[PDB]
C-alpha cells in the first residue's frame, strides 16, 4: 500500500518536521492532507508526477513539500505551531480513487521536557470473577505517558492476541485541567478460568511508546524519554 514514515512524531513548537510518503508504484498523483481531530482530510498539495499542480491550500511560509523525482515525496513544516497537531495523510492515485498511507500522527508541544514514557502494570484476575463467571479478566494499565503516542498489545505465550481484548479508544488525562497533562490507558484481556489457572500460560501487556531519539538534546535528570517498549507480565496461577 502507500507507505509513510514515521507513524508518530513529537516535536517542540518552533522546531521543524519532515513527513515521508511513498505512493503505490507507478502512481502519477500524490496528495498530502492534514486532518485534525473532528474533521475530514483537507488538501495541502497535489503533485502530478513531479509537478506541483495545486498548492493553493498550502498554508503559508511554514509548509513546503517536494516530489522531486515523481516517486516518493517529502512534506515539511518549519517552524511548527501547536495548532499543527494533527494526522498527516498521504494518498496516491492514477485517476479518481485514492489509496491512503497509514498516516503520521503529529503532536506539537510547548516543551519537550513534557515528554514521559508510560509505566505499565498488569493486574491479575479476581478470584470472585472466576467463581462467579468461570472467566478471568486481566487488566493492563499504562499511566503517566505523554504525548498520547502509544500502541498497546497483549501477548499470550509469546504470541499476540486480539480475541477477548479491548483497549480504551481514548486515553484519560491525569490532570484534565492542564494542557500538557500526561495520559493513562487501560486494556483488558479476558480468557477462560481454566486458561488463567494454568501456571504455564504466560501473559504480557506491551506498550510501544513513540518519543525522542538519540539526536535530541536532553538535560533533565530523568533519562531521555526515547521511543521504547515498556511492558508488564504475569503467569497463570493455580
Amino acid at each position: 500500500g502507500v507507505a509513510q514514515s514515521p507513524r508518530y512524531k513529537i516535536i517542540e513548537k518552533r522546531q521543524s518536521v519532515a513527513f515521508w510518503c511513498n505512493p503505490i508504484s507507478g502512481h502519477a498523483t500524490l496528495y498530502w492532507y492534514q486532518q485534525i481531530l473532528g474533521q475530514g482530510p483537507k488538501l495541502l498539495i497535489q503533485f502530478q508526477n513531479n509537478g506541483v499542480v495545486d498548492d493553493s491550500q498550502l498554508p503559508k511560509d511554514r509548509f513546503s513539500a517536494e516530489r522531486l523525482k515523481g516517486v516518493d515525496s517529502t512534506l515539511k513544516i518549519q517552524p511548527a505551531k501547536l495548532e499543527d497537531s494533527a494526522v498527516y495523510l498521504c494518498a496516491s492515485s492514477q485517476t479518481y480513487e485514492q489509496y491512503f498511507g497509514p498516516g503520521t500522527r503529529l503532536t506539537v508541544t510547548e516543551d519537550l521536557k513534557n515528554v514521559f514514557p508510560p509505566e505499565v502494570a498488569v493486574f491479575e484476575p479476581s478470584e470472585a470473577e472466576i467463581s462467579h463467571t468461570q472467566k478471568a479478566t486481566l487488566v493492563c494499565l499504562a499511566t503517566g505517558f505523554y504525548p498520547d503516542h502509544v500502541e498497546l498489545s497483549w501477548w499470550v505465550n509469546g504470541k499476540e492476541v486480539h480475541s477477548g481484548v479491548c483497549t480504551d479508544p481514548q486515553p484519560l488525562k491525569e490532570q484534565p485541567a492542564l494542557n500538557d497533562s500526561r495520559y493513562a490507558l487501560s486494556s483488558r484481556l479476558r480468557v477462560s478460568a481454566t486458561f488463567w489457572q494454568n501456571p504455564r500460560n504466560h501473559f504480557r501487556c506491551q506498550v510501544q511508546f513513540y518519543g525522542l531519539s538519540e539526536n535530541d538534546e536532553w538535560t533533565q535528570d530523568r533519562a531521555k524519554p526515547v521511543t521504547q517498549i515498556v511492558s508488564a507480565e504475569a503467569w497463570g496461577r493455580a
Binding site: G38, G101, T133, T137, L138, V139, L172, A184, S186, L189
Partner: protein, 194 residues
C-alpha cells in the same frame, strides 16, 4: 462543498443506520464512501456507481438530479463502528473533496448481563489494585469520575470471538489511600459486589 450528517450515530446492534451527503457542483462525476477508525487512515468502503452499489448489509445510492449520495447499513454490527467519510471529486477535476465525517458507534447486543464490580491485584507485589465493572448491558452508561485522583475509563466491549460472547467493562483506579471500588462505581445497575 461536500456536506454529510453531523452525527454522531449511536445505535443498538441490529439497527438500520442511514447516511446522506450532498455535493454542490452538478458536474461532479465520481463518488465514494470511505471509512476510518479513529487512529487510522481513510479506506474505501464502497464506490457509488451510477446505479449505486450493494454489498451484503451495505447499500449506497446516487441521486444525481438531487446531487446527493446515500449509505444504508442494515442489521448493523459492532465492527461497523467507525467514522464514515463522504467523498466526491471537485467537479471537472480528479481532486477529491472529503466531507467532515459522521461518527457511527454500534452498541453490542448483550443478552446475558451479569453486572459485577471486581477488585484486581497487581501481578508485581506492590499492593496496588484496580477496579473492574463488567458484564453490564449496553443500556448501562459509564460516567467520568467526579473526583480528582479517581480515574474511570469509558466502557469498552471485548469479543471472545471463538465462542460469540461479548462483554462490556470499564476500569477504575486511584492512589487515594482509602479508595474502594464502590467509590468510583457508585450506584449504576444491580451488580454483584463481592
Amino acid at each position: 462543498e461536500v456536506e454529510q450528517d453531523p452525527g454522531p450515530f449511536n445505535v443498538p446492534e441490529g439497527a438500520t443506520v442511514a447516511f446522506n451527503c450532498t455535493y454542490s457542483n452538478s458536474a461532479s462525476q465520481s463518488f465514494f464512501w470511505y471509512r476510518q477508525d479513529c487512529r487510522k487512515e481513510p479506506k474505501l468502503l464502497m464506490s457509488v456507481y451510477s446505479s449505486g452499489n450493494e454489498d451484503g448489509r451495505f447499500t449506497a445510492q446516487l441521486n444525481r438530479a438531487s446531487q446527493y449520495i446515500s449509505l444504508l447499513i442494515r442489521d448493523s454490527k459492532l465492527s461497523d463502528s467507525a467514522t464514515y467519510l463522504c467523498v466526491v471529486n471537485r467537479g471537472s477535476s480528479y481532486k477529491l473533496i472529503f466531507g467532515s465525517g459522521t461518527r457511527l458507534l454500534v452498541r453490542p447486543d448483550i443478552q446475558n448481563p451479569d453486572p459485577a464490580v471486581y477488585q484486581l491485584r497487581d501481578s508485581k507485589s506492590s499492593d496496588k489494585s484496580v477496579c473492574l465493572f463488567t458484564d453490564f448491558d449496553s443500556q448501562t452508561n459509564v460516567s467520568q469520575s467526579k473526583d480528582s485522583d479517581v480515574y474511570i475509563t469509558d466502557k469498552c466491549v471485548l469479543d471472545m470471538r471463538s465462542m460469540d460472547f461479548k462483554s462490556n467493562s470499564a476500569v477504575a483506579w486511584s492512589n487515594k489511600s482509602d479508595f474502594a471500588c464502590a467509590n468510583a462505581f457508585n450506584n449504576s445497575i444491580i451488580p454483584e459486589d463481592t
